[PDB]
Amino acid sequence: VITNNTTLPEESELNVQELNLSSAALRAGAFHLGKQCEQANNEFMLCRQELDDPRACLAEGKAVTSCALDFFRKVKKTCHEEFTQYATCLDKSSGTMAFSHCRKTQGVFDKCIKDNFDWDRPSYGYFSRAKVIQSAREAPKKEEKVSYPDATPGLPEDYPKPPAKYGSRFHWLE
Amino acid sequence: MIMILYWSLPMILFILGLFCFVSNRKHLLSMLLSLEFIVLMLFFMLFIYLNMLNYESYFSMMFLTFSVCEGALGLSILVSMIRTHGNDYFQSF
Amino acid sequence: AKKVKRDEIEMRSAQNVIFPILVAERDREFLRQLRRNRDEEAELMKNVPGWEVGTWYGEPVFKTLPEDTLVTPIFKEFYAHSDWKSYAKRAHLKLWS
Amino acid sequence: MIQLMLYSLIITTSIIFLNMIHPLALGLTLLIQTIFVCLLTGLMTKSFWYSYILFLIFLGGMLVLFIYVTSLASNEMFNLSMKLTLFSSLILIFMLILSFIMDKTSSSLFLMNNDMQSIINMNSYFMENSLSLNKLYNFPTNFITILLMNYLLITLIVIVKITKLFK
Amino acid sequence: SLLKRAWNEIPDIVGGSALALAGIVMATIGVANYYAKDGDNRRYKLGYVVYRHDDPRALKVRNDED
Amino acid sequence: SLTPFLRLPLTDLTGCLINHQTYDKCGKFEMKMMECFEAYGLERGKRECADLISDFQECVGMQKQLMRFHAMRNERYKQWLKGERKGQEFFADPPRVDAY
Amino acid sequence: SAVNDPLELLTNKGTHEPSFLSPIWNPIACGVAGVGAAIFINWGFRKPVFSGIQKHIA
Amino acid sequence: QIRLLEDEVRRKMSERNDYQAYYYRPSVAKYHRISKEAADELEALRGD
Amino acid sequence: MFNNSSKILFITIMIIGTLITVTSNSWLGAWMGLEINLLSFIPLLSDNNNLMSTEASLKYFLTQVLASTVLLFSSILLMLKNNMNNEINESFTSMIIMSALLLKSGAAPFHFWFPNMMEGLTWMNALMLMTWQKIAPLMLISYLNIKYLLLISVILSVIIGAIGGLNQTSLRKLMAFSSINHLGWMLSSLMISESIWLIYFFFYSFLSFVLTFMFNIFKLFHLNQLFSWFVNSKILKFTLFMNFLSLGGLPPFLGFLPKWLVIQQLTLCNQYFMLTLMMMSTLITLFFYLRICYSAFMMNYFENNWIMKMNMNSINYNMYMIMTFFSIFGLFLISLFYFMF
């Protein structure tokens, strides 16, 4: 559908660093990553939710990936062995990648995080709730109603109905 | 052409079904079986359309529930007919 | 059942955390690929009677949409210059090619 | 490839269908047709839910009537002809090699299987039948199901009215 | 009379029938209990739900624990 | 949708029978249309819904867009038949699977 | 006037006086029908057309 | 004279179908709006 | 409601099914209602008491089922290639939908099933097929707007519809041919307008309803039976039989009121040629009706000897000849009808 008159981004604009991480890699660091960077995501894919045109969300998307990148670099520096083991459980242990089979490693990895940043593992569903947030993009689309001035009119109930003219106005009045 | 590449196969089968429905058969069973094949093709056209549609898909059941009832009615009158004449053979017609 | 709901929700809560990162790395490739896809549509119909990229010989495919409205190409269009190996690699993943 | 091969198998069986005249041979032919059509609609669908459904109603239960009442048997068994089989094999193969030749994509449907939907689609990450079958039960489009069940009830009142001719 | 008559003739149906009446009553109890908490601002939402601040849904989001 | 003449209480079963609109990109186009049909009736509206019907049809129907592709790829094959495209150039690069 | 005005030509300016028959005609047509129908009833049943005037009044 | 006028008007009003009368065919978005409401009702409901 | 209690049930389901069609919003819903009609009607038509009923059943089912099959099929195509129920214009997508509907209601080129039916059907069963099984397909024909096909149907809707009626000696087949001719008038009338079509069908329903309802009463099944049917006076033999001329709608019989209405509006559309043809054939319709009325116009014929008394139901006879009296003096109610303006 796209045409040469349409506007698209620059190659350089798209060219930003991405995670390169595996499923087990992400799903291991999920929880302690979710609460560190949620504003990034929230306003990011909030504008995506309300407005679908991705051309504008590119900037905040770059922020989202950067923020996640920052967290894992901290993880890389501080708790490597703990996190890696937790990752190794979470995939080797099951083909469904469920947290309910190596919680012991999950606990010890939490200990290391408790020692380094002293952050707390969020609730069972801390991200399951709604996300009511502040407005940063500040672009509510306009709520509007269409107007067809020349729509087909009928007979209002106030239009006066003078009693009939010339009986039934038929052949012999009847 | 869209229909020639996509809705063509359903046509060719549907027309072949009808011709077999108006051919020559010792009894009417081949006819009922012929229209039954047509129902499957009828489902085929119906589903590809309902697949154009995000959730209107479910209408399959409505068509299927109705279609099987036609078949049941079809077998109903035939089987009562053998029982009446001792046969439902086209020579009786 | 409380235990079943407990872990399923945890999946869903872990689920929502991950998702935006996938979308973010998703948008870049979509726009990158669209750039290339328009380039080839331009570079392959160089000698065609009246070809107009993104339209059918003139008139736009969509008109009620305002200008600078991006309509995601249908899957086939997005793969208009691709081999089966590419096509199946995504299409037939439920079926496990 | 599976899709167009499945067209080919349906075409060949259809040619078989229009030739065969023995009622079992026809009824047998329907049986194969049903598996094929279930396969085919499944491919172009979001999932195989409807395919399993119409399989067990149409084929599983309802073709039992057709075979059973068409157990007339002709009083004698098949005289199978290896020739129509060989033509069936012959027509299948060069249709199959053409299927190997035909354009990989353009010869395919355009419908949107669960996989062929875009990643961003937040709706697609639900149970595959949840959102499809939603409004078969949620108002105000659910009463029609009530009409279906009563239709079937009435269908039984009809069958006992036709199938009860003095015996 | 009819009471023991059925309970002597069709015991499984009598037992089954008592089961059905039990279920519907507790089913109505289920619906009632469901709408005590309003049952629609459900705690956990499928997909990724987000609201701008002050949205009437946002004003309604449960602040409870689970 | 063709107008039931009588509009009795049993249009109330099948009128909302199956709806284009809900959870459909074309549904937005359906509303852009069906409001006008309400405004201009079904005969003047069918006269004056040129763009509305065109796009609504195009979205679900995909006729214009899809046929554009079919000619687009045929033309690729046609140059191959004339021999312009060789074993390498005959196809383009594969989109990253995680796209679309 | 000398002016073929569509609206004023159509307007209920009046000058339409009902007859003594103008409104009464329908009552003395339907009732006459029903009375005749009852006579028709008895005529075919081989009963006195006069008899059973309850049918005629109703 | 009035009868001739009525036919002429009836001719125009049928040709254009402007007015919501004999030569009109009312449409209905009600059912689409209703289905729109059902979609709204169940989107917010999703998820336990 | 002929013999059993189930007659009431299937009639009810039939009504609901057909009422769905006329109130159907989309082609699929209309198809749904049509099949429900197909169910509900077969058991009434297929009485288990005799034989002829059962053969009519296969032909009715084996025809209607194909009609519904094609109707839905052509619906999908139209409502694919147009992606909308109301196509912009009538193309090859749409003529098939009429051809389905025309067969379903038994129109001109697709009628042969319909005479063969009558042999099987009893009277009120026939009656019920005559009147009500033609509403839904016709009201749908209203939605379809292909001029020329309706026109060929109207052309041929009287030619065969009267030429055959000349030939039949079984009252069952005559009613078939009589209606096919009358069906010619409805089809033209619906091409013109719908409000007049609604009226004309209703008067046709009324007239056919009274007609066959007495034939049911006296069980007169063959022209010989009409000549032989005892009446005490051989005067009500003649008073009752005016309705056979109300079939032709000659002014003092109340069949004129609908035919006048259709003619007036049709010529207002200026299809004068079409009127001439239908109205030429109308005479042939009225021709064999006089062929029927040789039994009663003259009096005091040669009769059978054994009969001494003639008897019939109270309810049917009491209802019947009220409807007749209206068929006699109906016109003076010119005022009472106000739906023509």
Side-chain angles (χ1 to χ4, degrees):
Chain A
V1 178
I2 312 311
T3 58
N4 65 335
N5 61 11
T6 318
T7 70
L8 276 165
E10 191 66 13
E11 305 96 355
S12 53
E13 282 162 359
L14 308 185
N15 298 323
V16 75
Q17 181 52 31
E18 60 85 10
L19 268 293
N20 317 100
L21 259 63
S22 165
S23 164
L26 279 185
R27 206 193 287 283
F31 277 98
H32 301 274
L33 165 60
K35 189 177 177 182
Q36 294 308 141
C37 76
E38 71 284 17
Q39 317 321 140
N41 305 302
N42 272 344
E43 284 81 4
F44 157 59
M45 52 86 87
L46 167 52
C47 70
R48 196 77 196 285
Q49 197 99 346
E50 291 174 18
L51 196 73
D52 285 321
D53 193 77
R55 269 90 59 76
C57 82
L58 176 49
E60 299 166 357
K62 294 147 160 286
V64 165
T65 177
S66 62
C67 295
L69 213 64
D70 308 346
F71 159 84
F72 275 123
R73 294 162 66 72
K74 295 308 310 311
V75 176
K76 188 160 204 169
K77 293 147 197 201
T78 42
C79 294
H80 177 88
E81 280 296 350
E82 272 84 352
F83 178 71
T84 285
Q85 279 165 341
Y86 178 48
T88 292
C89 273
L90 197 59
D91 50 345
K92 288 271 185 288
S93 293
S94 311
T96 190
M97 302 275 267
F99 309 135
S100 57
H101 299 281
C102 192
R103 290 173 177 172
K104 304 158 286 188
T105 312
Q106 186 179 2
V108 183
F109 162 85
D110 186 74
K111 296 296 296 302
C112 191
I113 292 283
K114 197 76 169 186
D115 302 332
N116 286 268
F117 313 138
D118 193 2
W119 289 334
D120 290 321
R121 204 173 90 84
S123 166
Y124 43 76
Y126 170 86
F127 317 95
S128 172
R129 282 82 184 268
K131 280 82 168 179
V132 308
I133 63 160
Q134 199 59 13
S135 183
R137 186 187 51 159
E138 307 279 33
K141 193 263 281 176
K142 293 86 193 186
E143 304 186 16
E144 179 57 17
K145 203 176 201 173
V146 178
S147 313
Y148 289 117
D150 291 331
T152 178
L155 205 49
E157 303 91 334
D158 301 75
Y159 197 100
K161 276 60 159 194
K165 197 185 170 184
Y166 277 107
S168 184
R169 296 191 39 67
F170 194 18
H171 273 306
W172 57 100
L173 203 67
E174 183 178 0
Chain B
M1 292 169 260
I2 302 308
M3 51 165 207
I4 306 305
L5 292 168
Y6 296 109
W7 317 334
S8 61
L9 162 58
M11 295 296 172
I12 307 305
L13 286 169
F14 184 92
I15 63 161
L16 293 174
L18 291 203
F19 300 138
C20 290
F21 185 72
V22 293
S23 71
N24 303 359
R25 301 289 184 278
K26 183 72 175 61
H27 312 150
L28 320 177
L29 286 167
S30 290
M31 304 204 157
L32 278 81
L33 208 48
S34 56
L35 62 83
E36 196 61 353
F37 157 89
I38 289 155
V39 169
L40 288 171
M41 295 299 102
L42 202 57
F43 186 88
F44 191 53
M45 284 76 75
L46 187 77
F47 207 91
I48 198 184
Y49 183 90
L50 294 174
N51 186 305
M52 284 297 192
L53 273 172
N54 196 7
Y55 292 162
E56 307 196 40
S57 185
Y58 76 98
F59 197 81
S60 61
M61 291 66 78
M62 307 324 198
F63 161 81
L64 294 174
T65 58
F66 279 36
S67 306
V68 299
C69 289
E70 321 186 320
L73 279 167
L75 275 297
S76 198
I77 59 179
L78 276 295
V79 68
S80 73
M81 186 178 288
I82 308 144
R83 175 264 303 283
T84 60
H85 307 69
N87 46 4
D88 60 9
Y89 305 167
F90 197 89
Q91 57 252 36
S92 303
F93 296 96
Chain C
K2 297 221 77 159
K3 295 311 307 182
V4 188
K5 187 178 74 61
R6 174 70 289 146
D7 70 0
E8 172 161 4
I9 289 291
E10 264 182 9
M11 295 298 102
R12 198 192 330 293
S13 193
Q15 184 62 45
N16 274 304
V17 164
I18 297 169
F19 179 53
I21 297 162
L22 299 168
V23 176
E25 82 188 19
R26 144 72 177 151
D27 311 324
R28 287 174 268 286
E29 273 291 356
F30 186 58
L31 297 171
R32 180 185 312 290
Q33 186 58 22
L34 278 180
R35 293 283 300 182
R36 286 145 176 181
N37 211 358
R38 199 174 66 191
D39 306 347
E40 304 203 78
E41 184 176 14
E43 300 273 5
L44 188 58
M45 311 325 148
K46 298 160 159 292
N47 299 127
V48 175
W51 192 246
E52 296 200 8
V53 303
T55 67
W56 181 250
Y57 297 111
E59 62 282 36
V61 69
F62 265 105
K63 65 186 302 321
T64 190
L65 303 168
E67 189 52 28
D68 198 88
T69 291
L70 194 173
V71 172
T72 63
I74 49 173
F75 184 99
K76 295 177 62 154
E77 176 186 13
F78 194 98
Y79 284 59
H81 318 101
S82 300
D83 66 346
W84 198 231
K85 194 174 302 318
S86 48
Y87 194 98
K89 197 163 185 179
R90 172 162 176 88
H92 306 92
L93 179 52
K94 171 47 56 184
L95 312 180
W96 314 306
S97 173
Chain D
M1 183 278 288
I2 304 159
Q3 303 177 17
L4 191 153
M5 293 177 70
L6 201 53
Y7 294 165
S8 298
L9 282 172
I10 285 160
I11 288 299
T12 306
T13 51
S14 58
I15 297 302
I16 290 301
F17 178 62
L18 68 90
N19 286 319
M20 301 195 138
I21 298 171
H22 195 287
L24 269 293
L26 291 148
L28 184 149
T29 311
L30 269 295
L31 164 57
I32 294 89
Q33 280 285 114
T34 295
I35 294 90
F36 292 173
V37 171
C38 299
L39 282 147
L40 176 50
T41 44
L43 278 165
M44 76 184 77
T45 301
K46 291 295 183 195
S47 75
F48 303 102
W49 164 271
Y50 293 113
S51 306
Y52 290 113
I53 295 299
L54 67 89
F55 198 116
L56 67 95
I57 295 89
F58 182 104
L59 184 157
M62 182 278 288
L63 264 174
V64 188
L65 302 204
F66 271 88
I67 307 315
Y68 162 69
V69 168
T70 59
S71 295
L72 191 143
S74 196
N75 316 316
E76 275 92 14
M77 295 326 108
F78 303 125
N79 197 320
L80 304 177
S81 163
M82 56 289 286
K83 302 82 182 173
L84 282 297
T85 72
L86 177 48
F87 296 154
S88 307
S89 178
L90 176 40
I91 201 174
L92 186 67
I93 207 67
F94 74 84
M95 192 85 86
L96 167 53
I97 200 73
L98 171 153
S99 177
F100 179 90
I101 292 156
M102 185 64 72
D103 177 21
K104 55 202 72 63
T105 68
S106 65
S107 54
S108 178
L109 301 169
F110 44 75
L111 302 181
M112 311 276 287
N113 184 330
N114 186 291
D115 294 351
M116 293 183 286
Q117 265 169 339
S118 186
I119 295 89
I120 58 176
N121 188 306
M122 73 292 291
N123 312 332
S124 58
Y125 301 107
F126 309 146
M127 289 65 91
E128 75 280 15
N129 311 326
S130 173
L131 273 293
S132 70
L133 320 182
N134 200 2
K135 69 203 186 75
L136 184 63
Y137 281 62
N138 291 284
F139 275 181
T141 49
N142 78 334
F143 296 143
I144 308 105
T145 71
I146 308 308
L147 180 140
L148 280 194
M149 65 179 288
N150 303 344
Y151 174 24
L152 290 144
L153 185 159
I154 298 154
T155 315
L156 190 150
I157 302 297
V158 173
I159 196 69
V160 302
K161 170 68 69 178
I162 295 300
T163 67
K164 184 62 65 67
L165 185 155
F166 291 84
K167 61 206 71 59
Chain E
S1 309
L2 182 143
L3 291 79
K4 287 168 73 175
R5 174 176 167 73
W7 178 248
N8 197 356
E9 186 183 357
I10 60 170
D12 65 326
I13 308 311
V14 183
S17 306
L19 192 74
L21 262 62
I24 182 61
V25 176
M26 61 187 206
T28 57
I29 294 158
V31 182
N33 172 41
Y34 179 90
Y35 286 99
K37 69 191 159 42
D38 192 13
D40 270 14
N41 200 23
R42 292 173 184 187
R43 195 86 199 85
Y44 310 136
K45 302 178 188 306
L46 277 161
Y48 198 100
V49 189
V50 162
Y51 306 107
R52 284 187 186 284
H53 64 291
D54 80 1
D55 207 356
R57 294 83 49 74
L59 185 49
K60 189 58 170 67
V61 297
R62 312 195 169 282
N63 51 2
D64 301 330
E65 189 63 15
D66 56 359
Chain F
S1 171
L2 71 164
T3 61
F5 172 69
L6 302 166
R7 305 202 297 270
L8 315 183
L10 185 56
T11 314
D12 307 349
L13 276 290
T14 62
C16 54
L17 171 43
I18 61 170
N19 170 277
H20 212 68
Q21 173 214 70
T22 60
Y23 312 94
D24 195 351
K25 54 162 181 93
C26 183
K28 284 272 291 303
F29 296 91
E30 201 265 310
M31 282 296 78
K32 281 188 288 292
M33 211 196 288
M34 192 59 68
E35 305 293 6
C36 179
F37 268 80
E38 203 71 6
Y40 299 150
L42 177 50
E43 50 284 19
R44 193 142 90 88
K46 194 193 296 188
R47 199 198 324 288
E48 284 300 344
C49 295
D51 68 320
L52 305 165
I53 289 164
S54 298
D55 283 28
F56 171 79
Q57 175 139 207
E58 209 292 328
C59 183
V60 65
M62 294 182 286
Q63 287 276 352
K64 190 165 173 194
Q65 182 172 359
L66 179 50
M67 66 182 179
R68 185 181 63 82
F69 151 80
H70 267 289
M72 189 182 164
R73 212 183 191 199
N74 285 334
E75 177 53 29
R76 162 166 294 258
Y77 267 35
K78 201 191 298 298
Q79 289 179 19
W80 176 94
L81 182 148
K82 262 72 180 174
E84 307 303 335
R85 322 197 61 72
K86 294 291 296 198
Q88 192 276 348
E89 294 76 3
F90 184 37
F91 285 106
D93 303 334
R96 195 159 160 282
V97 296
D98 303 332
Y100 193 78
Chain G
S1 166
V3 182
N4 284 311
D5 191 324
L7 170 52
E8 311 296 300
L9 183 63
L10 266 69
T11 296
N12 178 4
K13 184 50 52 174
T15 75
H16 301 127
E17 323 315 327
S19 56
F20 165 52
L21 184 51
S22 284
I24 304 295
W25 167 252
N26 272 1
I28 67 179
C30 47
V32 171
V35 176
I39 287 169
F40 202 69
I41 282 282
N42 303 302
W43 173 258
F45 273 64
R46 273 175 43 85
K47 305 193 304 193
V49 298
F50 307 154
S51 173
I53 53 168
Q54 198 274 317
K55 304 304 300 186
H56 303 70
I57 304 151
Chain H
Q1 218 185 359
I2 301 158
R3 293 217 281 210
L4 300 148
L5 185 148
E6 287 169 335
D7 263 8
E8 185 183 359
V9 175
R10 279 181 178 281
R11 283 183 84 74
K12 301 292 98 177
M13 164 187 140
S14 84
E15 294 147 33
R16 308 191 191 180
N17 301 118
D18 310 326
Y19 188 79
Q20 294 194 10
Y22 306 96
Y23 312 139
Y24 184 57
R25 189 184 288 274
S27 187
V28 59
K30 174 198 90 172
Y31 290 99
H32 300 289
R33 271 181 289 258
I34 286 157
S35 299
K36 155 72 171 313
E37 294 294 328
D40 291 331
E41 271 205 60
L42 295 174
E43 284 172 22
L45 184 61
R46 265 206 307 278
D48 57 355
Chain I
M1 44 175 70
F2 316 149
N3 292 5
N4 70 69
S5 63
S6 196
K7 299 297 192 186
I8 302 174
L9 166 55
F10 296 142
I11 287 292
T12 309
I13 308 308
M14 183 279 288
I15 287 293
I16 293 289
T18 290
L19 192 151
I20 291 155
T21 58
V22 295
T23 52
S24 175
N25 174 35
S26 200
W27 293 107
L28 311 194
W31 167 84
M32 293 177 70
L34 291 168
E35 201 286 300
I36 297 169
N37 186 359
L38 187 151
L39 171 78
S40 312
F41 202 89
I42 286 158
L44 311 183
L45 187 153
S46 193
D47 183 6
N48 286 7
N49 186 18
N50 296 82
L51 175 144
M52 70 299 294
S53 184
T54 304
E55 291 87 6
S57 190
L58 66 84
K59 291 185 288 293
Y60 181 65
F61 169 90
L62 288 162
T63 297
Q64 289 269 329
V65 65
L66 170 55
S68 79
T69 286
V70 180
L71 188 154
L72 179 146
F73 155 73
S74 181
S75 80
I76 281 161
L77 271 294
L78 175 142
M79 170 274 297
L80 270 168
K81 177 174 285 300
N82 290 138
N83 293 282
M84 181 45 188
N85 285 294
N86 302 317
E87 64 192 357
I88 295 302
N89 50 72
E90 272 55 40
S91 185
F92 301 110
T93 65
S94 61
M95 283 74 75
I96 296 88
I97 312 190
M98 293 177 70
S99 79
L101 294 157
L102 286 161
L103 179 43
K104 187 157 284 187
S105 45
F110 324 119
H111 65 308
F112 298 96
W113 58 284
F114 179 65
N116 299 4
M117 211 75 97
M118 296 296 172
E119 304 292 2
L121 308 187
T122 186
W123 273 117
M124 191 154 159
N125 292 66
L127 193 172
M128 183 66 198
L129 194 153
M130 295 299 291
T131 305
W132 192 272
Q133 295 300 84
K134 290 205 196 197
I135 294 171
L138 273 168
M139 185 63 73
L140 277 296
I141 285 278
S142 75
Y143 292 124
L144 294 174
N145 198 17
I146 301 91
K147 187 265 281 180
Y148 53 80
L149 284 199
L150 269 183
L151 185 82
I152 295 300
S153 186
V154 181
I155 289 158
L156 305 170
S157 298
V158 305
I159 297 161
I160 58 184
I163 293 158
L166 296 173
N167 211 0
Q168 303 306 328
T169 64
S170 194
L171 273 56
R172 322 176 156 291
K173 292 275 197 62
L174 282 77
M175 191 75 168
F177 281 110
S178 163
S179 184
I180 295 158
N181 166 81
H182 290 291
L183 189 68
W185 282 64
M186 277 151 267
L187 286 165
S188 62
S189 184
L190 200 47
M191 196 304 297
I192 298 300
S193 166
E194 73 84 14
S195 184
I196 73 175
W197 168 91
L198 196 66
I199 296 162
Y200 171 42
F201 161 75
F202 160 61
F203 281 119
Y204 181 75
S205 60
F206 175 87
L207 183 150
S208 295
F209 177 47
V210 58
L211 182 67
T212 53
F213 184 75
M214 70 144 278
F215 278 127
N216 185 4
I217 277 169
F218 292 107
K219 281 205 316 203
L220 311 171
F221 290 91
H222 202 275
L223 282 72
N224 316 334
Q225 296 208 316
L226 269 295
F227 281 104
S228 165
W229 162 54
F230 176 92
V231 186
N232 63 331
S233 81
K234 299 195 181 190
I235 321 183
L236 282 297
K237 182 71 165 295
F238 175 21
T239 306
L240 300 177
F241 285 21
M242 311 325 178
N243 291 27
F244 293 100
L245 281 70
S246 197
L247 269 287
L250 206 56
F253 289 137
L254 182 59
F256 176 78
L257 182 62
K259 306 292 174 53
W260 164 34
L261 284 165
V262 171
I263 292 164
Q264 158 182 339
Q265 301 317 139
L266 194 159
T267 190
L268 181 53
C269 174
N270 311 96
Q271 302 259 341
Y272 311 93
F273 187 106
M274 181 36 49
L275 271 170
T276 47
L277 268 285
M278 301 177 328
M279 184 176 176
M280 181 285 258
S281 56
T282 307
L283 273 76
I284 311 178
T285 295
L286 180 61
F287 179 93
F288 66 91
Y289 276 116
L290 277 296
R291 207 171 49 72
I292 294 169
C293 289
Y294 304 161
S295 68
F297 284 1
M298 294 182 286
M299 280 80 84
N300 313 130
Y301 298 175
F302 277 37
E303 193 177 9
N304 283 328
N305 67 344
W306 58 83
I307 311 182
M308 61 145 267
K309 179 59 73 173
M310 60 79 71
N311 185 8
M312 73 292 291
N313 185 357
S314 172
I315 306 307
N316 302 324
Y317 203 82
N318 184 359
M319 185 63 72
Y320 153 68
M321 61 166 208
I322 301 156
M323 285 178 312
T324 315
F325 167 87
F326 275 71
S327 173
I328 302 302
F329 316 108
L331 269 75
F332 64 92
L333 310 172
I334 60 171
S335 65
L336 179 53
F337 317 90
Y338 80 114
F339 308 93
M340 81 186 59
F341 297 107

